[PDB]
Amino acid sequence: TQRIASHSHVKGLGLDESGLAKQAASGLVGQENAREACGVIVELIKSKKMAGRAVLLAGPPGTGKTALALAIAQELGSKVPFCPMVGSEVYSTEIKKTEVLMENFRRAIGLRIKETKEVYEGEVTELTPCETENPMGGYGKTISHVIIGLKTAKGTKQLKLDPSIFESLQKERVEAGDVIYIEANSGAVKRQGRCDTYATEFDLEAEEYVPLPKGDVHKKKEIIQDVTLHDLDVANARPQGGQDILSMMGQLMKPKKTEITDKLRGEINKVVNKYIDQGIAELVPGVLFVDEVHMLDIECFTYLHRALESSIAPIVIFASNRGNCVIRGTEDITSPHGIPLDLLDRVMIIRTMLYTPQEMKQIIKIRAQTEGINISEEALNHLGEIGTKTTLRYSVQLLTPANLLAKINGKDSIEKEHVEEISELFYDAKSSAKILADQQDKYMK
Amino acid sequence: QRIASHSHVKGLGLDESGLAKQAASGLVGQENAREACGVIVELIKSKKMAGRAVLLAGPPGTGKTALALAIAQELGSKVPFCPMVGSEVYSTEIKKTEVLMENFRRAIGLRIKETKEVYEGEVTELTPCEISHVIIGLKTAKGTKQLKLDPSIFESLQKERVEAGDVIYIEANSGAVKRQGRCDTYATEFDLEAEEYVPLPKGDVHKKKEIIQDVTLHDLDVANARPQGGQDILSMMGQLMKPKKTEITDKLRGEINKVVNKYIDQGIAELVPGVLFVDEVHMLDIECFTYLHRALESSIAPIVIFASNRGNCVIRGTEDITSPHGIPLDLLDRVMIIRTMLYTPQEMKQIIKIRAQTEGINISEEALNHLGEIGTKTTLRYSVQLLTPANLLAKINGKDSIEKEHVEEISELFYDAKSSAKILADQQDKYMK
Amino acid sequence: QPVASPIGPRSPGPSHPTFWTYTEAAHRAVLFPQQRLDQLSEIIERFIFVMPPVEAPPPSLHACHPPPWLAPRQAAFQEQLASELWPRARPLHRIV
Amino acid sequence: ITPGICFSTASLVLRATDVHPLQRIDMGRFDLIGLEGRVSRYEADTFLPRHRLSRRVLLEVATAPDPPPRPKPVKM
Amino acid sequence: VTRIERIGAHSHIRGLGLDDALEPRQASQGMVGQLAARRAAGVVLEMIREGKIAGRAVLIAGQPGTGKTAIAMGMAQALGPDTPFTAIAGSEIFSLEMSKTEALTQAFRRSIGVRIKEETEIIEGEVVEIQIDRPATGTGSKVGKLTLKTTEMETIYDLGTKMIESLTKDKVQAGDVITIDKATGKISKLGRSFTRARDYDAMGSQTKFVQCPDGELQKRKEVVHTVSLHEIDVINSRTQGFLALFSGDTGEIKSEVREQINAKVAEWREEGKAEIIPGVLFIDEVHMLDIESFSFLNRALESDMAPVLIMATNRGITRIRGTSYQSPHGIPIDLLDRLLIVSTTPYSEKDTKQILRIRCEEEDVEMSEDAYTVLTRIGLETSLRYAIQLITAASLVCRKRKGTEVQVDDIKRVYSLFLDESRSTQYMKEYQDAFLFN
Amino acid sequence: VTRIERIGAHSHIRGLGLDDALEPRQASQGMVGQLAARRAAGVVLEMIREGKIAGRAVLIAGQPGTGKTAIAMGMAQALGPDTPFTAIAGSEIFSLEMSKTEALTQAFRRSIGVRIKEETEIIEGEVVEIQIDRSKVGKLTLKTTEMETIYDLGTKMIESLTKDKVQAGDVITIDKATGKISKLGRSFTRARDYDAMGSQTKFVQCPDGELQKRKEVVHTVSLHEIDVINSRTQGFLALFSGDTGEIKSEVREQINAKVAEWREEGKAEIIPGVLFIDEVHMLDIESFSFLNRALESDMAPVLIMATNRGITRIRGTSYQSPHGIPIDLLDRLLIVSTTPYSEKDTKQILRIRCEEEDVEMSEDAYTVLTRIGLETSLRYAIQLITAASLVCRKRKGTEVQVDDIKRVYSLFLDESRSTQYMKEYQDAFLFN
Ligand SMILES: Nc1ncnc2c1ncn2[C@@H]1O[C@H](COP(=O)(O)OP(=O)(O)O)[C@@H](O)[C@H]1O
Ligand SMILES: Nc1ncnc2c1ncn2[C@@H]1O[C@H](COP(=O)(O)OP(=O)(O)O)[C@@H](O)[C@H]1O
Ligand SMILES: Nc1ncnc2c1ncn2[C@@H]1O[C@H](COP(=O)(O)OP(=O)(O)O)[C@@H](O)[C@H]1O
């Protein structure tokens, strides 16, 4: 978090309340049409009423596609799930590509569960049965309640409980002076150790003595837990915590992703629907971002057709900087973005354009501000001129070496000489390619 | 019973002299092929030759699989017949040669006499003997007997929750203890016990029954390669940790051969050589064919029937080597080729009528002629497959028989391969790739 | 131990932050193998019927003069493994 | 139910890998994976460098007479 | 509140929309047009419902966007949950855990259901009083008594030890409406007829009550157990198969196990124990199968346990994967002879407009007639799916400007913001050097 | 004596030979020439040392023998052993156990070090008496050289003491928070003069000082190690075996959050490092595509790369790219070019190698060897250094002369002479 990454300046989409894109806001410069389309897509995500919709960010490299996707993620917030993914990740040695894609799809669909957990804490001060003056059956003594006195830091309360709790109390070996907690939703007593006021400095127990609970005896709170469908699927496919031989085998064996069946996924969907109907949980459909979609092969694209046609799928964002390239896994089949035309028919294409020199200068200034670097106007103009040739990434990547060189030279700002020296020290892609071409005989292969 | 593609094939339709009747046993033509298949059936019944391979060659729809299933039906249900497709050797667990060898052993069956010892009765006394043995008392309608059993049987009895008054079945051979229920005599003591009651066994406590077990060589190989008969912890551990198939060694197969030979010599076992059928042999690759060379040259191998519809085609696994049936000439030198021919329109009409009878469909003579004409173009398979949709149309319209109008309507609704090819050619720019 | 799961670890009590982070609803949506077996008891009773055609004990290695320490070591290993693992295999008794 | 396979081999084969202790070195001086879960950084870094025995201390303790018997507890 | 299932591509299709004579209506149950293809689908659906012919294969072939998957989903919705419908993609059979033939076999056997129908004795009533007496110390025989009540009965039951233990585990109290199966002794609580005593603490908020059951106490009810052939294979393959039912990881099931299961199911069907419910396997984009998978399909459709197989492909004369052979639809001619082909014709202007109207009704979007005309023109020019996407895009744009009806301006705005394949390809040609490869 | 680390191809390099202004000296710390490249390496090293910016990529490009691996080793040496430096080859990411992206993720997470600091109160003493009354309650007596006390035990403490078979004379430490007992050793008494000792028992002196002590442990681990530890129940074994598999992304995110929590709590510090991939041209297009977005994370180290390829074919594709690397990744990285060496630089490198190998050479021998190195290659001359040293020692000489160099030149062939001799007898060799 403290370290500055390449998209550390993107705090969202700089959109007006009417959806129009401001020239420079929220860390984004230019790309007004793409930003407006991404805002429409953000509204679509927030509407939560569409499934399997796909958006493709298409444009030359270094044109803000990943920045736009991260701006979408920032606009949605941490509540909305956002599962980034590169196309190379589908090639796994454990599960098939379709399984990886399905798992990421289920990772993007989130579920938020709201529940109230009511507990009674305290140190047991009193344990007195409530006998009845008329014993049932004539002989012996009958009891109708068990009075438990619970003491905390700022109070003491008595709880008239069901007589059946006597067995749980004996099983937990609860005696006077012990700290216990009783859960309302289950009616069970759990002994979380003994109070520390009865412990001496000469005792050696570690987890036996516990501090007296603070606060009130009756504690209730609302617990909000955010989970994804993939979390439930994996937790049910390879369960952890059992005491049977299968759980022991799972612990022993090397963990391995498995092909989760449609039966388990249907059961999870049914449980989630039941929870939603009960009012416990609220569905939070998020976004799956698949960067470098062109690295997927023809099998992945074909599966993606069925994946997107599903009614449970999230909203998928693709990104490709390829032209009329050959689809991987096929022999001499060319498609406009490296994506077969069948999948391109299922997506909405957002075009990202190249940046004018003014926009490049603005982006350089913003990146310098984010990295804590003061740059002079002449140095900024020289770096923008360097960015007119070469690329924008080269210019934003010369900022920190130049700052280091200035600091070594003893200056708090980047001057033009520092940028010139850095340009002399480091070559760009075009200059290196020219050097290689001029000496193609001396290099290898 | 559901009607499959070969449900009408009941035999080869041969006379006593081996000649082929025109229409008999659900077969219409292929008289020479049926006579050859009868010779092969007699060879299989002889149980003298080993590793004799037969190749059924011909265009699709000429009844190669029908002839193979007719051979199977002629042999009977006692003789093993293992049908495998050539595409099934490409497993992710074992090598292709291992799959071929396993199907080879699957084709050889063994009828072996076995005696089962059974202890069955109601438990009257369950006294441990400190590893702790058990002394158990069982009663039936014929007598009572007290037995001393191994600690494993006691563990099984405890796992079954067997208590005094329960009717139990113990197999002494496998040590398998099954609790069947609380004795019926105690069903009136309570009104809700959560028990399944059983009457008292009416035989003897100790019984010996002689039964015939039908097993194959592959079953013995699997049982001795992934053992689960010891009922020990190691067997369970091996089953749970190593569930995949393994490459069974030639040493295990030699040991199983020795054991089976000893059983046959003792007179308590009978060997049934059986048949293996590989349908799409062209889907095998050159390594599989090379292995099959030596496998067929073996004196243990069964009779293998191969099928292929390929013409002069490139063998899979080779770059550009082309062979007459997709089969390298070395393996073709080791096979007897049975050639199937295309059917005349009369034979197509006969087959359509037979299939209609099999599916319980009444078809008029005009409709039968129209469907045979439809089958003259397109293929016989397409013509046969239109019977059920036409029957459904006739049933919807309230007619109990198929008329020519129903056949015409169905043919209009459903296209064939040639019509679809014509449509694709006419609209090549609109379809993908 | 349960890293990245809807099931939280065994919190000692409400004083621990993990007590108020996880819900019982999430816990009830994850089924242990014993719960799965209890859910499929009728299916196991009705549909588990396949028996291997042949049943054999594992092959045994015999030598005339074996190392006198191998057999006791193997016996002790098997005995300890059985004493530790057989109680955990009781739920699969009906399947076996 | 079939009897198991009795595989008979030479008794000399089962001793092929066995090496007499006088013919092999102690490999426990290179056992790194065995130390995990049993030896702590405290023992290796702070305790053992300070409280390693010396030959002089060992000889002194061995040669010295037995220590006096431990006094009985007294409620004081 | 939004359920886990939301508005998808085929969310408006509730069935094929046919009449009794399988004559397709122009617009019913979401389906529009494709009259011949819908009639063929209805005939195939009747064949599936009859469930008498095994291993029938149907190929839905047509241009992209002609409603092949729409027709398949309509067939699936018209079948109903009783009949199995396994829908997979062609790419899904390529697995590192199992062979292609094994995956295809499992896909087939997931489409056949085995149903076992049996009658059991069932006790359903309101607990009035439950008493359980247990020894104070040491092992002993617990003695108990339970009272159950309906609207017309009340019986006092003497309880055995195992029923006592079951009731203790279930924590059955007075007022709990419980179900008892006499054979297995299983007890299932289904509610409380009234609240517990108020004087007790730490009890929580009482939920709603359940009315006491009527009729006799011990009734007779029909219990139905339904599993697929694949589930039987998995749970019989190995001891851990029941966990493999959820984790996958079945490996390759032995053919011996499957043969035993086929024999046992045939025996059960003859003995009237179980009924077979054949279903459908839908392989979308079957052109991704290779030659080996097609060859396996050739002979796998010849079994009597095979379901009806429905394929969809939009390929013309194309090279078969794994070979260098060009074939129609990417399928070998040997398999093409075993299947009936259903062609889908392209949609006209009125069919496109009706599809757009149904989609707008499904998405709760109100659109003007001029907007419908413009959107239909766009769909004819670009594609149907592009127009469907622009539907929602324009709905959102209209909602942004505090409107109520989607106008032509919103459609033009979303046409400007989002591009089709053609305009994207044009703009990429304009900047060909900027894009990376070719 | 001969230690496991011996004279290698870069043993003479101890650093980059730069001053405080990152100006390269002509010959310092074992590096000759490559002034611009060494200055660029120093700039990159300062960027690494600051640690503020994440995911910076540098490509060291040049002709073979121009010092790319030399510069990388100089950077690794100049960087302290405190900062992690994972050096892998391009071929090492092709594993049969984990995917290429998983291998690259593990390499990335091995390059970020997490220094942990745990302070724990412990009791440390020698056991005097253990009395257990009837496994219910008991007393334990512990002593030091200056102290002795008795403790009251509970049920779990008694169980832990019985499980570990703790007896009298044992020297033990007890963690107050968790109660776990580890045995340091046992005290030596006249009665414990065993003739045979077990493989784990060892005699230690009774601890001095006070029975209650605070234990401070500071160690450096990588993120990948924490991932492997928390992957499974005994995952630390995979830190030795390497049978890690593909770690779940959710586990990695949880561990990242926990590490941030430790960093906030003051219990851990982050030391981002360097991942050096030598001969990157062996990476496939999938690996490059993964690297494109892996560098964009906030927990990505500095990626230094080195290739000697010209405009060549990218592995896994049929396209030609300037270094074998797709231009999208090349736009994300700064390229440091190495120039070919001159005669003076070659002679200075030969002098450094001779000094490293402790070989005395005459000036005429140096001239001849420099001429050979310019004609054939620098590495050939470096090998001829040792060859001529061996020949000189064989004839009982002390200084390598021109005769020794000529002899080893005739004995050992470079690539050109061997290729010529093969062309003379081309038909003799197989599969031309
Ligand atoms: N319009 C923009 N406004 C602000 N920053 C941008 C913009 N476009 C790109 N950047 C920044 O410049 C860098 C270029 O990367 P990027 O354009 O995201 O690559 P790609 O084009 O492959 O998505 C990124 O770190 C991004 O944060
Ligand atoms: N001679 C015949 N008599 C009756 N039915 C036949 C005959 N030949 C083929 N059939 C039927 O036609 C269909 C095609 O047969 P099949 O053996 O699958 O063809 P092939 O094996 O040549 O591909 C099968 O369902 C079979 O029952
Ligand atoms: N005849 C139709 N009636 C109703 N909706 C249709 C029809 N044809 C296509 N659609 C809708 O158009 C969208 C794209 O059609 P689709 O069926 O995916 O084409 P394909 O046949 O190429 O799969 C789907 O959401 C589908 O619901």
Ligand SMILES: Nc1ncnc2c1ncn2[C@@H]1O[C@H](COP(=O)(O)OP(=O)(O)O)[C@@H](O)[C@H]1O
């Ligand atoms: N500037 C230099 N200073 C010292 N030694 C060098 C220098 N450049 C190259 N070398 C030596 O030359 C040899 C080959 O160079 P190296 O960097 O390892 O491979 P390459 O540069 O061909 O990738 C190495 O043994 C290295 O010690």
Ligand SMILES: [Mg+2]
């Ligand atoms: Mg489709």
Ligand SMILES: [Mg+2]
């Ligand atoms: Mg190098």
